[PDB]
Amino acid sequence: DPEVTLLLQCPGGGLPQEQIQAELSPAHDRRPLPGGDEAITAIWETRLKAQPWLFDAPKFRLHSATLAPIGSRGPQLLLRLGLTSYRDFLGTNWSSSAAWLRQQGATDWGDTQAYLADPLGVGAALATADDFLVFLRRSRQVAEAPGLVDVPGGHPEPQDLAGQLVVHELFSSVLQEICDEVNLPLLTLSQPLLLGIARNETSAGRASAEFYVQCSLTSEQVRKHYLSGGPEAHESTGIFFVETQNVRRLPETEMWAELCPSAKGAIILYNRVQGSPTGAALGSPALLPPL
Ligand SMILES: O=C(c1csnn1)N1CCOCC1
């Protein structure tokens, strides 16, 4: 799977909100482009003169994420974040020249990402009461990953002493994206656990935080809520469910070639962090069948 790389695998089965610190600093921003940010402004002007209803939005930028020594007390993860925008994404990661910008960043800064917007995504491994994960089908008419399978998620918009409010917005945003697209009541969802961070090498290395969320509704009840919104209540074109039993071997299935990179990252981290038991009971052959 060359189109996804793991940047972070969380310990303890995943981290709760209270164990994460954020540092939001202009030191974590994209570097100005070598020949100037006028190249971004030109791409944006061309796009608005074809689609004048488009609008810019702020985004968080991922610089890096440092895990504490395993088994330690106190905060377990430090997220170093800057600020970026949808406009800067279109002019860098989404540009035909994105690979040239990665090479220039290695040369100038020793950092393949230094010239890339790198907006932070969120995604969820969303489990039902009857032990299935939730999958969504993308429209065949959108620009990114048309017709592919995704999981619930999105790219959160901004608004440890500004830090804790940023971590709160990240955790809040993955629940809001589940309520907006799957049409589930907020009170049927668990507090999220962070499983890790995955990079999309098809989008010049932009990263997504991948979370585990449990729902108190069955697969049948989740399906009814999604469909009862009607076609205008969701961007996806369909919902479907895979038993958690079967997610273990998903990379060996024909479904794997249909998954978009950020959804592949969610399922790899689910299998490594929530699956893959370490104890004698769940690791016994009848409960963890060999192969
Ligand atoms: O929020 C984002 C986004 C992706 S990368 N940074 N921003 N979207 C949603 C709307 O359609 C375009 C992509």
Side-chain angles (χ1 to χ4, degrees), residues 1-72 74-140 142-158 161-290:
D1 294 314
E3 70 253 29
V4 62
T5 69
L6 307 180
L7 303 184
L8 170 68
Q9 180 168 329
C10 290
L15 297 179
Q17 191 181 324
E18 299 71 22
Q19 289 178 22
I20 300 163
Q21 178 174 3
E23 178 178 38
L24 181 61
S25 174
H28 301 150
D29 287 359
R30 184 188 50 83
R31 300 300 105 233
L33 301 187
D37 284 355
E38 292 102 316
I40 295 168
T41 295
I43 285 159
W44 185 239
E45 289 284 333
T46 298
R47 180 51 74 85
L48 286 176
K49 286 180 178 168
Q51 294 187 336
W53 57 91
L54 286 189
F55 54 89
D56 197 11
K59 302 288 163 175
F60 296 107
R61 180 170 193 273
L62 181 64
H63 173 277
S64 57
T66 298
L67 199 70
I70 57 171
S72 62
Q76 293 299 112
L77 182 63
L78 175 61
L79 299 175
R80 299 188 190 80
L81 301 175
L83 293 179
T84 190
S85 66
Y86 187 54
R87 177 178 166 277
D88 287 4
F89 167 79
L90 285 183
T92 63
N93 294 79
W94 187 252
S95 166
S96 59
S97 291
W100 289 7
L101 290 179
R102 292 186 98 181
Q103 177 183 18
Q104 277 289 332
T107 295
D108 295 349
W109 295 93
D111 173 10
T112 56
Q113 312 306 113
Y115 298 128
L116 291 183
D118 277 0
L120 182 63
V122 301
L126 170 63
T128 62
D130 63 334
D131 299 307
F132 293 77
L133 297 192
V134 181
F135 295 91
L136 300 169
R137 179 69 67 168
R138 294 179 65 76
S139 172
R140 281 168 297 188
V142 298
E144 176 150 27
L148 297 189
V149 178
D150 213 344
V151 292
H155 284 82
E157 290 175 27
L161 266 63
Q164 293 297 101
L165 291 172
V166 174
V167 177
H168 189 268
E169 161 63 344
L170 290 180
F171 277 74
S172 290
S173 76
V174 72
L175 300 175
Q176 194 66 55
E177 292 289 355
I178 294 161
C179 296
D180 293 348
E181 183 63 13
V182 193
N183 201 27
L184 299 182
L186 182 63
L187 295 181
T188 66
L189 305 175
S190 70
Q191 289 303 320
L193 294 174
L194 180 67
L195 301 168
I197 303 172
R199 133 186 305 179
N200 181 347
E201 301 294 358
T202 77
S203 193
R206 65 175 162 96
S208 290
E210 303 297 347
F211 296 81
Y212 173 60
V213 178
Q214 179 73 49
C215 182
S216 64
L217 306 173
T218 65
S219 65
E220 153 201 318
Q221 290 177 312
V222 172
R223 185 192 261 112
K224 169 208 151 287
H225 284 265
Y226 173 89
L227 291 169
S228 88
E232 297 302 65
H234 40 80
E235 172 149 9
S236 65
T237 64
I239 192 166
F240 68 90
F241 307 88
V242 179
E243 303 89 329
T244 58
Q245 173 191 272
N246 296 328
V247 171
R248 192 179 176 206
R249 299 195 76 168
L250 214 63
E252 296 174 80
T253 73
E254 290 188 323
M255 186 174 149
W256 198 246
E258 303 202 2
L259 262 192
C260 74
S262 63
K264 291 181 173 189
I267 298 308
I268 295 163
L269 285 166
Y270 174 87
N271 282 336
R272 290 184 74 141
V273 176
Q274 280 289 315
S276 303
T278 41
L282 287 186
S284 289
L287 283 180
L288 191 65

